[PDB]
Ligand binder design. Structure first.
Ligand SMILES: [Cl-]
Ligand SMILES: [Cl-]
Ligand SMILES: [Cl-]
Length: 163
């Protein structure tokens, strides 16, 4: 575990993270994809061997000894708000199980279903609150990666609010 488990946020490419493992915002088919998924494919392509997994699940594949946790959030273009919300919460609970199983002291994590799977809606708060529900009982240092300047400020504020 980390000596004083924390949450932090950085605005940069998650492929340049400084943590002991990475969560990919994966598609269900283990394809290179776009956005976070394509950056992860360029950095850790060996981790996409048999990475296909259903919506609401996470599957870990090692790149050397570096763990890539493929977490499949719902595409809100296809899911109802209700069913999508349930699957998004479930994907983060499966990330918390994998992080715990791996015995890492730190994890780099993107906000699932906030990009091309958002169905054109701002899901910062929805996705971050599901991340917190899952990860609060883990003792890993969590570092959230984003690309937008206004998102960095809002994520930082939400972390600081809980103290
Ligand atoms: Cl960068
Ligand atoms: Cl997405
Ligand atoms: Cl972002």
């Amino acid at each position: 575990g980390a000596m004083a488990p924390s949450y932090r946020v950085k605005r940069m490419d998650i492929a340049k993270n400084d943590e002991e493992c990475v969560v990919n915002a994966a598609n269900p088919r283990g394809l290179p994809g776009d956005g976070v998924c394509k950056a992860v494919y360029k950095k850790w392509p060996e981790s996409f061997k048999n990475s296909a997994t259903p919506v609401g699940t996470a599957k870990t594949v090692m790149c050397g000894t570096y763990p890539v946790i493929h977490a499949v959030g719902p595409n809100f273009s296809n899911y109802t708000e209700s069913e999508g919300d349930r699957e998004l919460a479930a994907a983060y609970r499966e990330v918390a199980k994998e992080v715990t199983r791996l015995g890492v002291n730190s994890v780099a994590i993107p906000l699932l279903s906030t990009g091309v799977y958002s169905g054109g809606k701002d899901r910062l708060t929805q996705s971050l609150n599901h991340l917190f529900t899952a990860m609060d009982s883990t003792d890993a240092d969590v570092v959230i990666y984003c690309r937008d300047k206004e998102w960095e400020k809002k994520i930082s504020e939400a972390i600081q609010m809980r103290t």
